[PDB]
Design a protein around this nucleic acid. Structure first.
Ligand SMILES: [Cl-]
Ligand SMILES: [Cl-]
Ligand SMILES: [Mg+2]
Ligand SMILES: [Mg+2]
Ligand SMILES: [Mg+2]
Ligand SMILES: [Mg+2]
Ligand SMILES: [Mg+2]
Ligand SMILES: [Mg+2]
Ligand SMILES: [Mg+2]
Ligand SMILES: [Mg+2]
Ligand SMILES: [Mg+2]
Ligand SMILES: [Mg+2]
Ligand SMILES: [Mg+2]
Ligand SMILES: [Mg+2]
Ligand SMILES: [Mg+2]
Ligand SMILES: [Mg+2]
Ligand SMILES: [Mg+2]
Ligand SMILES: [Mg+2]
Ligand SMILES: [Mg+2]
Ligand SMILES: [Mg+2]
Ligand SMILES: [Mg+2]
Ligand SMILES: [Mg+2]
Ligand code: NA
Ligand code: NA
Ligand code: NA
Ligand code: NA
Ligand code: NA
Ligand code: NA
Ligand code: NA
Ligand code: NA
Ligand code: NA
Ligand code: NA
Lengths: 46, 82, 143, 56, 81
RNA sequence: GUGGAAGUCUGUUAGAGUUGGUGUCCUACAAUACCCUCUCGUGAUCUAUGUGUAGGGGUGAAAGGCCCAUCGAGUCCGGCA
RNA sequence: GUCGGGUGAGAACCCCGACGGCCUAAUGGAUAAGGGUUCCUCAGCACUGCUGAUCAGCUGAGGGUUAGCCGGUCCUAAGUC
RNA sequence: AGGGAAACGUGAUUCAACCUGGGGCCCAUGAAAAGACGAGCAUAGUGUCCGUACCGAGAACCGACACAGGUGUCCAUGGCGGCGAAAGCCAAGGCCUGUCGGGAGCAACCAACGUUAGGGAAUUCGGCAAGUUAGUCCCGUACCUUCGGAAGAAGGGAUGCC
RNA sequence: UGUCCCAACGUUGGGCCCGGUGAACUGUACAUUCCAGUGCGGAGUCUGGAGACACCCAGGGGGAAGCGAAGACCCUAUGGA
């Protein structure tokens, strides 16, 4: 497929939103990323 | 150490397209029995392998002369073609 | 040790199929340490990594048969599979023949043996398929 | 040909896309009209009294 | 007002361009053209920009590969920051 | 003899279809699959991509077929408890 | 697939060599759509993998896509606004 | 210049690509626009913006799955073979991942299948299934017919290697 | 011509044993049944007799009017299309 500059941007955001909750936040909150998205199991928008 | 003739007639009891594999196992089981050693301890030099797979996986020779030695601290046998 | 990364590299540096690249069984450790294309070329120069040879089919037996068939043999009813016009395309063959016969007549004319009228006549009968071959033509020519 | 599984394979066309206006993935790129907010059809936002119960 | 240059893009591959080809890689604002990147770079590091190659990254930013004239030295310009 | 016509023939060329085996499967590999067999294969041919037609309305070489696993009237929500 | 060998706490299935096979319009090579980081590297095995796994499309962190002359862009088509 | 360890050839045939001609068909007539040419040469400057990773499939797409399904284009000139882009065998290239293994001469039963004497459709709704025939050449070919066809009718003969 | 007389032997993948992985259908309760009888006239459970030491493996499916589906046939509804 041929993506646009806008499209590329969002895919980028999504990849970022796909990281895990930093170890330091665990400690800081005395104790899960519910939006984890797998490329195969899930499906993004557009 | 001695030279022994291994009969591979029981390899026919196994589906023909898988004779080579069964042969191989037979050799090991023969040496382990005639040299009173665990089959784990039996080492087959590749020569024996190539001899057995010479004509494909289903066309194994009815016999095979093999030369084996026995020794070491846990007991074992090393073998090869002849 | 996992040298699959290297294989891929070696395959490209030697410009060969990954399946032909060869790693010496006594240097998995060294090769395991190759990380760059360079370290690979180096290990190549030491002959630790080499490219096996690609085979080619032997056309020996095919050449012998090719002789026997050029000499006329091994082409009996029992060796033909295709229809007749399949083995020899009849339109193509008529083009071969007629061009011969037309070339022939053309020469004899310029040569002088034939008068533009005798030629004309013959030509017209060639196009009419009157001569099975140039030889057949020459014969007819001599009355 | 089965209308089921085998007919599902040819589905590689793109229709509904992220909407410039509402942000919902309902902008039909072929019709250039959003099935959710009505962008590309109505200046006003698509909205209906049947999206909720009669007395609510 | 948005600024063109965001910060230097320092990575192994950014090092090789620098040491081997006299190039400086930057993380720029994606609305910047090769032109704006060139000038902004010269004015900030007082150098002569010969070429600017750009790429819109899967990171949401735009990367710029700037080559300096044989007269300037990438390794040095980058060393002071 | 030449010529090379044809909703022409043979053809698992590619490709399109789906006659029989009422085989295999039938908590399947599969909510329509597998295999063998078989039809068409220069034409009313097959196909990709784009585009038009919308629900008592389309489309239909007509089987009430088809309109996203949904069709003697699609689907969603509402009327509605 | 087999015999050896490498690594590892742990190896039928991760890696090397040999032997033995499988694919020939594809199981090769290049791509459209579609997916969207799945690409590469390093570190890993609680999850995923029809068994196992030191392997991985998995987990974690890093890195990676450079164009005046390849596409888009421009033009017009059925047709759409 | 480049590339190759090295040699770093010459002739020929058949010739995909590409080029250029002739003929035939239509109760069917096989886009348009931008642009290019027409309309020279030197030197210099400019040539922004967006796409570019990877898969492209018996694990990266659709099908709830790492689904035996579905899904377009280019390579149609690798060798033997042959009419062939057919079968079979084999290169190049790719793979052992259509991904659980070990053991029993491994029984009954089942799936795919080979071979069965004598008989030969007696089986069965029915010859279902299976089988028979088979490529090429020569000889030869009925009724009927819209003269096109029937027709590869049938039937008979040949077939290797040197 | 193994369709049949009339079946045989063999090949490959299962089947059987072992390691690993590991579901579903179904379940008022009780339950080792058989022959009769009885009962809403089609009983493992009532009544009379008979038989029956408990557990487990394989099998081909006689019975549980076996499992699967609020019967498509028929009638009824001041039902629908
Ligand atoms: Cl492109
Ligand atoms: Cl001509
Ligand atoms: Mg990342
Ligand atoms: Mg002709
Ligand atoms: Mg339907
Ligand atoms: Mg660019
Ligand atoms: Mg035809
Ligand atoms: Mg045909
Ligand atoms: Mg279409
Ligand atoms: Mg009807
Ligand atoms: Mg739907
Ligand atoms: Mg990877
Ligand atoms: Mg690793
Ligand atoms: Mg690429
Ligand atoms: Mg798989
Ligand atoms: Mg018989
Ligand atoms: Mg009868
Ligand atoms: Mg039949
Ligand atoms: Mg009693
Ligand atoms: Mg009822
Ligand atoms: Mg009725
Ligand atoms: Mg009514
Ligand atoms: Na997806
Ligand atoms: Na940044
Ligand atoms: Na004629
Ligand atoms: Na079929
Ligand atoms: Na309607
Ligand atoms: Na309602
Ligand atoms: Na495996
Ligand atoms: Na050929
Ligand atoms: Na039989
Ligand atoms: Na039963």
């Amino acid at each position: 497929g041929k993506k646009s500059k806008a499209t590329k941007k969002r895919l980028a955001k999504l990849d970022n939103q796909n990281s895990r909750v930093p170890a330091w936040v665990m400690l800081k909150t005395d104790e899960r990323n519910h939006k984890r998205r797998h490329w195969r199991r899930n499906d993004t928008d557009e | 150490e001695r030279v022994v003739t291994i009969p591979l007639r029981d390899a026919r009891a196994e589906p023909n397209h898988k004779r080579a594999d069964k042969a191989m196992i037979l050799i090991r089981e023969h040496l382990a029995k005639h040299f009173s050693v665990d089959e784990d301890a039996v080492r087959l030099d590749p020569s024996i392998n190539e001899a057995a797979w010479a004509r494909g996986r289903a066309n194994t020779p009815s016999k095979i002369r093999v030369r084996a030695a026995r020794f070491e601290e846990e007991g074992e046998a090393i073998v090869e073609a002849e | 040790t996992d040298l699959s990364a290297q294989k891929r590299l070696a395959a490209d540096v030697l410009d060969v199929g990954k399946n032909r690249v060869w790693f010496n069984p006594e240097r998995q450790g060294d090769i395991a340490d190759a990380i760059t294309r360079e370290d690979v070329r180096e290990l190549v120069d030491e002959g630790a990594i080499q490219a096996k040879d690609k085979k080619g089919n032997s056309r020996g037996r095919a050449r012998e048969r090719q002789k026997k068939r050029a000499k006329g043999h091994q082409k009996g009813a029992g060796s033909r599979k295709g229809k007749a016009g399949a083995r020899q395309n009849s339109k193509e063959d008529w083009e071969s023949r007629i061009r011969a016969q037309r070339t022939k007549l053309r020469e004899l004319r310029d040569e002088g043996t034939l008068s533009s009228s005798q030629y004309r006549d013959l030509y017209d009968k060639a196009g009419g398929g009157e001569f099975d071959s140039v030889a057949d033509l020459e014969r007819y020519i001599d009355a | 040909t089965g209308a089921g599984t085998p007919s599902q394979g040819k589905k590689n066309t793109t229709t509904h896309t992220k909407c410039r206006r509402c942000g919902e993935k309902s902008y039909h790129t072929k019709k250039k009209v959003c099935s959710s907010c009505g962008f590309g059809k109505s200046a006003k936002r698509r909205d209906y009294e049947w999206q909720s119960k009669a007395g609510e | 007002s948005w600024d063109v240059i965001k910060h230097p893009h320092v990575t192994e591959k950014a090092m090789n361009d620098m040491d081997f080809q006299n190039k400086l890689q930057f993380a720029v604002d994606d609305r910047a053209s090769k032109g704006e990147v060139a000038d902004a770079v010269e004015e900030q590091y007082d150098v002569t920009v010969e070429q600017v190659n750009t790429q819109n990254t899967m990171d949401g930013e735009k990367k710029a590969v700037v080559r300096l004239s044989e007269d300037d030295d990438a390794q040095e310009v980058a060393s002071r920051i």
